[PDB]
Amino acid sequence: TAMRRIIPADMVERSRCPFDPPPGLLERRGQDAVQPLQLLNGARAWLVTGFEEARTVLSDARFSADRVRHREATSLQPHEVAEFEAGTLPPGPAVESREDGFFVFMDPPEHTRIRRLLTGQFTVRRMRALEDRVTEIAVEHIEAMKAAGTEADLVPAFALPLPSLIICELLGVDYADRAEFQERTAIGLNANATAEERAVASAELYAFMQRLVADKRANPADDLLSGLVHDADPPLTDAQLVDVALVLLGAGHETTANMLGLSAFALLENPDQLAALRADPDLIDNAVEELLRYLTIIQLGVSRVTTEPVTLGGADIPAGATVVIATPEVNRDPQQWPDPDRLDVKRPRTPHLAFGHGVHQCLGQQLARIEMQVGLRELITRLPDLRLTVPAEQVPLRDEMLIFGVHALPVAWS
Ligand code: HEM
């Protein structure tokens, strides 16, 4: 169930055009907003390209996020497709039976009970604290790049480490454990790492999270994970806390890192937009929202399953169907954004779907916005005459993974 064994290539392959929609998404423009999608495993799903239709999927009681109970077409092993199509593939476990912390695969009220504990740690006071910590880590990384020379690969020097170290801050990873943590999270994202090298790094992090939760139970500090372990009422089990720590790491690192690298890339390819930002630093917050709309690193990973038949976007979707949001095309819906394929950091700011919608809308979105606002402000103000040192078409793209991004971003400054 690797993404490229499931999603048709033309819906995700950018070739050497990172900012342009893949041709299979382009070819659905001006058609019904919801259309069938034939998956490479032979299973059927439905694809949503409409903004209003995507909002409905993500905030309608007939579309379930419980992808444990409701099997998705995108999850099917080859031996399971004919059972799925025949309606004889069993559901996963009923949520009443589950003891795990994977609240991402739950609907209200089971979702709500765990999501409330996490919102409870993402307080406005913690967010103010994290903005200061983001500022420190960003400036330290940029000052390190400038001390080492006049050129850098922005991905390992800046885009990967800042969000990884912010996860370390949330989880209360001790200073002496950070280098190893950073190494293991980087392996996950390395083009050159084998499936065996990855599965070892993944097992090392799972065991690390178990040890980290046990350590916060014994020796709590001021971090979000200490808060979940000690201050949560009602209390989570150790197993649930491990699951929540793995969810935060999974959700908060790769996305933010890829957004930092691709945002720097887009600004260097759109010097007029970079000029607007250097000229008026107050534009940074609106610019981050435009970059989130324009780049949409989530790709086709946002899906739900119908629990009853639904008519939407010109489609009669049956019960039990997988509905995939084409988040990059939803964020280019010309009903919402005139001239949607233009990067315009001065655009009037209106809601996009880069962080999803409804009860599961990104828990980390304020923190992600802080990382982008601070990161890009510090990069643009500290690195004069920042430039790519390879042509844009030679920057290597990550379009075989669930999250889109660049593998390298070679830059220089003066
Ligand atoms: C630019 C960076 C990011 C993007 C684009 C992003 C995008 C998303 C999206 C689209 C979802 C909704 C998925 C769905 O409904 O199926 C989501 C959920 C979530 N994200 Fe973010 N994310 C980012 C950063 C972060 C960060 C920094 C954290 C935490 C530190 C975080 C934690 C979460 C969590 C825990 C969920 C699950 C929420 C739930 O199911 O209730 N994310 N993210």
Coordinates of C-alpha atoms and ligand atoms in Angstrom, one line a residue:
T1 CA 0.0 0.0 0.0
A2 CA 3.0 2.3 -0.8
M3 CA 1.4 5.5 -2.2
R4 CA 2.9 4.9 -5.8
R5 CA 1.3 1.4 -5.9
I6 CA -2.2 3.0 -5.2
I7 CA -2.5 6.6 -6.5
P8 CA -2.3 6.9 -10.3
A9 CA 1.1 8.5 -11.2
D10 CA -0.4 11.4 -13.1
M11 CA -2.3 12.6 -9.9
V12 CA 1.0 13.1 -8.0
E13 CA 4.1 13.2 -10.5
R14 CA 5.3 16.8 -11.0
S15 CA 8.2 15.8 -13.4
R16 CA 10.4 19.0 -13.2
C17 CA 7.4 21.3 -12.5
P18 CA 7.1 21.4 -8.7
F19 CA 4.5 24.2 -8.4
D20 CA 2.3 23.1 -11.4
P21 CA -0.6 20.7 -10.8
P22 CA 0.1 17.1 -12.1
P23 CA -1.6 16.6 -15.5
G24 CA -4.2 14.1 -14.1
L25 CA -5.5 16.8 -11.7
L26 CA -5.3 19.5 -14.5
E27 CA -7.4 17.3 -16.8
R28 CA -10.4 17.3 -14.3
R29 CA -10.7 21.1 -14.2
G30 CA -14.2 22.4 -15.3
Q31 CA -15.8 19.0 -14.7
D32 CA -17.9 17.7 -11.8
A33 CA -16.2 18.5 -8.4
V34 CA -16.5 14.9 -7.3
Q35 CA -15.6 12.1 -9.8
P36 CA -14.6 8.4 -9.6
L37 CA -10.9 7.6 -9.2
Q38 CA -9.7 4.2 -10.3
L39 CA -6.8 3.2 -8.0
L40 CA -3.8 1.2 -9.3
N41 CA -4.8 -1.8 -6.9
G42 CA -8.0 -2.1 -9.0
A43 CA -10.3 -0.6 -6.2
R44 CA -12.6 2.4 -6.9
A45 CA -12.5 5.6 -4.9
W46 CA -13.9 9.2 -5.4
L47 CA -11.8 12.3 -5.8
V48 CA -12.9 15.7 -4.6
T49 CA -11.5 18.8 -6.4
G50 CA -14.1 21.3 -5.3
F51 CA -13.5 23.6 -2.2
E52 CA -17.2 23.6 -1.0
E53 CA -17.4 19.8 -1.6
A54 CA -14.1 19.2 0.3
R55 CA -15.4 21.3 3.3
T56 CA -18.6 19.1 3.3
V57 CA -16.6 15.9 3.3
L58 CA -14.5 17.1 6.3
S59 CA -17.5 18.4 8.3
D60 CA -20.4 16.1 7.6
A61 CA -21.6 13.3 9.9
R62 CA -22.0 11.0 6.9
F63 CA -18.1 10.9 6.2
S64 CA -16.1 9.0 8.8
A65 CA -12.4 9.6 9.7
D66 CA -12.5 6.1 11.4
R67 CA -10.3 4.5 8.8
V68 CA -9.6 1.6 11.3
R69 CA -13.3 0.6 11.4
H70 CA -14.0 1.7 7.8
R71 CA -11.4 0.1 5.4
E72 CA -10.2 2.6 2.8
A73 CA -9.7 1.6 -0.9
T74 CA -6.2 3.1 -0.6
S75 CA -5.3 0.6 2.3
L76 CA -6.2 -2.6 0.3
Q77 CA -3.5 -5.3 -0.2
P78 CA -4.0 -7.0 -3.6
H79 CA -5.8 -10.1 -2.1
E80 CA -8.3 -7.7 -0.5
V81 CA -9.6 -5.7 -3.5
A82 CA -12.1 -8.4 -4.8
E83 CA -13.5 -8.7 -1.2
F84 CA -13.8 -4.9 -1.0
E85 CA -15.5 -4.7 -4.3
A86 CA -17.9 -7.6 -3.4
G87 CA -18.7 -5.9 0.0
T88 CA -17.3 -9.0 1.9
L89 CA -14.1 -7.4 3.4
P90 CA -14.7 -7.1 7.2
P91 CA -14.5 -3.8 9.0
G92 CA -11.7 -3.1 11.4
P93 CA -12.4 -3.1 15.2
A94 CA -15.3 -1.1 16.6
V95 CA -14.1 2.1 18.3
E96 CA -15.8 1.0 21.6
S97 CA -13.3 -2.0 21.6
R98 CA -10.1 0.1 21.0
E99 CA -7.6 1.0 23.8
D100 CA -5.2 2.8 21.4
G101 CA -4.5 6.6 21.2
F102 CA -4.8 6.9 17.4
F103 CA -7.5 9.6 17.7
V104 CA -6.8 10.6 14.1
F105 CA -8.9 7.4 13.2
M106 CA -11.9 8.3 15.4
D107 CA -15.1 10.3 15.0
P108 CA -16.9 12.3 17.8
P109 CA -17.3 11.6 20.7
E110 CA -14.3 9.2 21.0
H111 CA -12.2 11.6 18.9
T112 CA -13.4 14.6 21.0
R113 CA -12.3 13.1 24.3
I114 CA -8.6 12.7 23.3
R115 CA -8.5 15.9 21.0
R116 CA -9.7 17.9 24.1
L117 CA -6.6 16.8 26.1
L118 CA -4.3 17.8 23.2
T119 CA -6.0 21.2 22.7
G120 CA -5.6 21.6 26.5
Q121 CA -1.8 21.5 26.1
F122 CA -1.7 23.7 22.9
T123 CA -2.7 26.7 25.1
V124 CA -2.1 30.3 24.0
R125 CA 0.6 30.6 26.7
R126 CA 2.4 27.5 25.4
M127 CA 2.1 28.9 21.8
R128 CA 3.7 32.2 23.0
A129 CA 6.5 30.1 24.5
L130 CA 7.0 28.1 21.3
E131 CA 7.2 31.2 19.2
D132 CA 10.2 32.3 21.2
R133 CA 11.8 28.8 21.0
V134 CA 11.1 28.8 17.2
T135 CA 12.9 32.2 16.9
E136 CA 16.0 30.9 18.8
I137 CA 16.2 27.7 16.8
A138 CA 15.7 29.5 13.4
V139 CA 18.3 32.2 14.1
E140 CA 20.8 29.6 15.5
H141 CA 20.5 27.5 12.3
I142 CA 20.9 30.6 10.0
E143 CA 23.9 31.9 12.0
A144 CA 25.4 28.4 11.8
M145 CA 24.9 28.4 7.9
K146 CA 26.5 31.9 7.7
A147 CA 29.5 30.8 9.9
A148 CA 30.1 27.7 7.8
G149 CA 30.3 29.5 4.4
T150 CA 28.3 31.3 1.7
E151 CA 26.4 28.2 0.4
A152 CA 24.2 25.6 2.1
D153 CA 21.7 22.9 1.4
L154 CA 18.7 24.5 3.1
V155 CA 17.0 21.0 3.6
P156 CA 19.5 19.5 6.1
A157 CA 20.8 22.9 7.4
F158 CA 17.4 24.4 8.3
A159 CA 14.2 23.0 6.9
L160 CA 14.6 19.5 8.5
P161 CA 16.1 20.4 11.9
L162 CA 13.9 23.3 12.9
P163 CA 10.6 21.3 13.0
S164 CA 12.4 18.2 14.4
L165 CA 13.7 20.3 17.3
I166 CA 10.2 21.8 17.9
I167 CA 8.9 18.2 18.2
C168 CA 11.8 17.6 20.8
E169 CA 10.5 20.7 22.6
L170 CA 6.8 19.4 22.7
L171 CA 7.8 15.9 23.8
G172 CA 10.5 17.1 26.3
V173 CA 13.4 15.2 24.6
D174 CA 16.5 15.9 26.8
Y175 CA 19.3 17.9 25.2
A176 CA 21.7 14.9 25.1
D177 CA 19.1 12.8 23.3
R178 CA 18.4 15.4 20.5
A179 CA 21.2 14.5 18.0
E180 CA 20.1 10.9 17.9
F181 CA 16.4 11.9 17.7
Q182 CA 17.2 14.3 14.8
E183 CA 19.3 11.5 13.0
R184 CA 16.4 8.9 13.3
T185 CA 13.7 11.4 12.1
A186 CA 16.1 12.5 9.1
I187 CA 16.5 8.8 8.0
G188 CA 12.7 8.6 7.6
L189 CA 13.0 11.5 5.0
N190 CA 16.3 10.5 3.2
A191 CA 15.9 9.7 -0.6
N192 CA 19.0 7.4 -0.2
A193 CA 17.8 5.4 2.9
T194 CA 16.8 1.7 2.2
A195 CA 13.5 0.3 3.4
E196 CA 15.6 -1.8 6.0
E197 CA 17.5 1.4 7.2
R198 CA 14.1 3.2 7.5
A199 CA 12.3 0.3 9.4
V200 CA 15.3 0.2 11.9
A201 CA 15.1 4.1 12.5
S202 CA 11.2 3.6 12.9
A203 CA 11.7 0.8 15.5
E204 CA 14.4 2.8 17.3
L205 CA 11.9 5.8 17.6
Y206 CA 9.0 3.5 18.8
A207 CA 11.1 2.1 21.6
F208 CA 12.5 5.7 22.3
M209 CA 8.8 6.9 22.7
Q210 CA 8.0 4.1 25.1
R211 CA 11.2 5.0 27.2
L212 CA 10.3 8.8 26.9
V213 CA 6.8 8.3 28.2
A214 CA 8.1 6.1 31.1
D215 CA 10.7 8.9 31.8
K216 CA 8.0 11.6 32.0
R217 CA 5.8 9.4 34.3
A218 CA 8.8 9.2 36.7
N219 CA 10.4 12.6 36.1
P220 CA 8.0 15.1 34.6
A221 CA 9.0 18.6 33.3
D222 CA 7.0 21.5 31.7
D223 CA 6.6 20.0 28.2
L224 CA 3.3 19.0 26.5
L225 CA 4.1 15.3 27.0
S226 CA 4.6 15.7 30.8
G227 CA 1.2 17.6 30.7
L228 CA -0.5 14.6 29.0
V229 CA 1.0 12.1 31.3
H230 CA 0.2 14.0 34.6
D231 CA -2.4 16.8 34.1
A232 CA -4.8 14.9 31.7
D233 CA -8.2 14.3 33.3
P234 CA -9.3 11.7 32.7
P235 CA -5.8 10.0 32.5
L236 CA -4.5 8.2 29.4
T237 CA -2.7 4.8 29.6
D238 CA 1.0 4.6 28.8
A239 CA 0.1 2.8 25.5
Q240 CA -2.2 5.7 24.5
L241 CA 0.5 8.3 25.4
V242 CA 3.0 6.5 23.2
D243 CA 0.4 6.5 20.3
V244 CA -0.2 10.3 20.8
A245 CA 3.6 11.0 20.8
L246 CA 4.0 9.0 17.5
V247 CA 1.0 10.9 16.0
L248 CA 2.6 14.3 16.9
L249 CA 6.0 13.3 15.5
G250 CA 4.3 11.9 12.3
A251 CA 2.1 15.0 11.8
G252 CA 4.4 17.8 12.8
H253 CA 7.9 17.0 11.4
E254 CA 7.7 16.0 7.7
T255 CA 4.9 18.4 6.8
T256 CA 6.5 21.5 8.3
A257 CA 10.0 20.6 7.0
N258 CA 8.7 20.2 3.5
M259 CA 6.8 23.4 3.7
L260 CA 9.9 25.3 4.8
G261 CA 12.0 24.0 1.9
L262 CA 9.3 24.4 -0.8
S263 CA 8.4 27.9 0.5
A264 CA 12.0 29.1 0.2
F265 CA 12.1 27.5 -3.3
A266 CA 8.8 29.2 -4.4
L267 CA 10.0 32.6 -3.1
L268 CA 13.4 32.2 -5.0
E269 CA 11.4 31.3 -8.2
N270 CA 9.0 34.3 -7.6
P271 CA 11.4 37.2 -6.8
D272 CA 8.6 39.8 -7.1
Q273 CA 6.8 38.1 -4.2
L274 CA 10.1 37.9 -2.2
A275 CA 10.5 41.6 -3.0
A276 CA 7.1 42.4 -1.5
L277 CA 8.0 40.6 1.7
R278 CA 11.5 42.2 2.2
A279 CA 9.8 45.6 1.5
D280 CA 7.0 45.1 4.0
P281 CA 7.8 42.5 6.8
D282 CA 4.1 42.9 8.1
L283 CA 3.1 40.9 5.0
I284 CA 4.7 37.7 6.4
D285 CA 1.5 36.3 8.0
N286 CA -0.6 36.8 4.8
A287 CA 2.3 35.5 2.7
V288 CA 2.5 32.2 4.8
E289 CA -1.3 31.7 4.2
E290 CA -0.7 32.2 0.4
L291 CA 2.2 29.7 0.4
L292 CA 0.1 27.2 2.3
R293 CA -2.7 27.5 -0.4
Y294 CA -0.3 27.6 -3.4
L295 CA 2.0 24.7 -2.4
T296 CA -0.4 22.3 -0.5
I297 CA 2.2 19.6 0.6
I298 CA -0.6 17.3 1.9
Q299 CA -1.3 15.9 -1.6
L300 CA -4.0 13.1 -1.7
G301 CA -3.5 11.8 1.9
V302 CA -6.8 13.5 3.4
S303 CA -9.6 11.0 2.9
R304 CA -12.9 9.8 4.6
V305 CA -15.3 6.9 4.2
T306 CA -19.1 7.3 3.6
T307 CA -21.4 5.6 6.2
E308 CA -24.5 6.1 3.9
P309 CA -25.1 7.1 0.3
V310 CA -24.3 10.8 -0.5
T311 CA -24.9 13.0 -3.5
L312 CA -22.1 15.5 -3.8
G313 CA -20.3 17.5 -6.5
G314 CA -22.3 15.8 -9.3
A315 CA -21.6 12.3 -7.9
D316 CA -23.8 9.6 -6.3
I317 CA -21.3 8.2 -3.8
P318 CA -22.4 4.8 -2.4
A319 CA -22.2 3.9 1.3
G320 CA -18.7 2.5 2.3
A321 CA -16.9 4.5 -0.3
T322 CA -13.4 6.1 0.0
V323 CA -13.5 9.9 -0.7
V324 CA -10.1 11.4 -1.3
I325 CA -9.6 15.2 -1.1
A326 CA -7.3 16.5 -4.0
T327 CA -6.1 19.2 -1.5
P328 CA -3.8 20.9 -4.0
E329 CA -6.7 21.4 -6.6
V330 CA -9.2 22.3 -3.8
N331 CA -6.8 25.1 -2.9
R332 CA -6.9 26.3 -6.6
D333 CA -10.7 26.3 -6.9
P334 CA -11.4 29.4 -9.1
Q335 CA -14.7 29.9 -7.3
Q336 CA -12.7 30.9 -4.2
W337 CA -9.5 32.4 -5.8
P338 CA -9.5 34.3 -9.0
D339 CA -6.2 33.5 -10.9
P340 CA -5.7 30.5 -8.6
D341 CA -2.4 29.3 -10.2
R342 CA -0.6 32.6 -9.4
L343 CA 1.4 33.0 -6.2
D344 CA 0.2 36.4 -4.9
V345 CA 1.3 37.1 -1.3
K346 CA -0.9 40.3 -1.4
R347 CA -4.1 38.2 -2.2
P348 CA -7.0 38.9 0.2
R349 CA -6.5 36.1 2.8
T350 CA -9.4 33.6 2.8
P351 CA -9.6 30.1 4.2
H352 CA -7.8 27.3 2.5
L353 CA -7.8 23.5 3.1
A354 CA -4.0 23.0 3.6
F355 CA -4.7 22.1 7.3
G356 CA -8.0 20.4 6.5
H357 CA -11.3 21.3 8.1
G358 CA -13.9 20.0 10.6
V359 CA -13.1 18.3 13.9
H360 CA -9.8 16.9 12.7
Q361 CA -8.4 20.2 11.3
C362 CA -4.7 20.3 12.0
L363 CA -4.1 20.5 15.8
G364 CA -0.7 22.0 15.1
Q365 CA -1.7 24.7 12.6
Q366 CA -0.9 27.7 14.9
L367 CA 2.6 26.1 15.6
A368 CA 3.1 25.4 11.9
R369 CA 2.2 29.0 11.0
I370 CA 4.7 30.2 13.7
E371 CA 7.5 28.0 12.2
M372 CA 6.7 29.3 8.7
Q373 CA 6.3 33.0 9.8
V374 CA 9.5 33.0 11.9
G375 CA 11.5 30.7 9.7
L376 CA 10.9 32.6 6.5
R377 CA 11.2 36.1 8.1
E378 CA 14.6 35.1 9.6
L379 CA 15.8 33.4 6.3
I380 CA 14.8 36.4 4.1
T381 CA 16.2 39.1 6.4
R382 CA 19.5 37.4 7.3
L383 CA 20.6 36.0 3.9
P384 CA 21.1 38.9 1.4
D385 CA 21.0 38.0 -2.3
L386 CA 19.8 34.5 -1.4
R387 CA 19.7 32.5 -4.6
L388 CA 19.5 28.9 -5.9
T389 CA 22.8 27.4 -7.1
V390 CA 21.1 24.9 -9.5
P391 CA 18.3 25.5 -12.0
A392 CA 14.8 25.0 -10.6
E393 CA 14.2 22.0 -12.9
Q394 CA 17.3 20.2 -11.3
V395 CA 16.0 20.5 -7.7
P396 CA 15.1 16.9 -6.7
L397 CA 11.4 16.4 -5.8
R398 CA 9.8 14.1 -3.2
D399 CA 6.6 13.0 -5.1
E400 CA 6.9 9.2 -4.3
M401 CA 6.1 10.0 -0.6
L402 CA 2.7 10.9 1.0
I403 CA 4.0 14.5 1.6
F404 CA 5.4 16.6 -1.3
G405 CA 8.6 18.5 -0.9
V406 CA 12.2 18.8 -2.1
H407 CA 15.1 16.4 -1.3
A408 CA 17.7 19.2 -1.5
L409 CA 17.7 23.0 -1.9
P410 CA 21.1 24.3 -2.8
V411 CA 21.4 28.0 -2.0
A412 CA 24.0 30.7 -1.8
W413 CA 24.0 34.3 -0.3
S414 CA 26.3 37.3 -0.1
Ligands
HEM1 C1 2.7 22.9 7.4 C2 2.6 22.0 8.3 C3 1.4 21.2 8.4 C4 0.4 20.8 7.6 C5 0.3 21.2 6.1 C6 -0.5 20.0 8.3 C7 -1.6 19.4 7.7 C8 -2.6 18.7 8.4 C9 -3.8 18.2 7.9 C10 -4.3 18.5 6.5 C11 -4.4 17.5 8.9 C12 -5.9 16.9 8.7 C13 -5.8 15.5 8.3 C14 -7.2 14.9 8.1 O1 -8.2 15.5 8.6 O2 -7.3 13.7 7.6 C15 -3.6 17.5 10.0 C16 -3.9 16.9 11.3 C17 -3.0 17.0 12.4 N1 -1.8 17.7 12.5 FE1 -1.1 19.0 11.1 N2 0.0 19.8 9.5 C18 1.1 20.5 9.7 C19 1.8 20.7 10.9 C20 1.6 20.1 12.1 C21 2.3 20.3 13.3 C22 3.5 21.3 13.4 C23 1.8 19.5 14.3 C24 2.1 19.3 15.7 C25 3.1 19.8 16.3 C26 0.6 18.9 13.7 C27 -0.3 18.0 14.4 C28 -1.4 17.5 13.8 C29 -2.3 16.5 14.4 C30 -2.0 15.9 15.8 C31 -3.3 16.2 13.6 C32 -4.5 15.3 13.8 C33 -5.7 16.1 14.2 C34 -6.9 15.2 14.5 O3 -7.1 14.2 13.8 O4 -7.7 15.6 15.4 N3 0.5 19.2 12.4 N4 -2.4 18.3 9.8

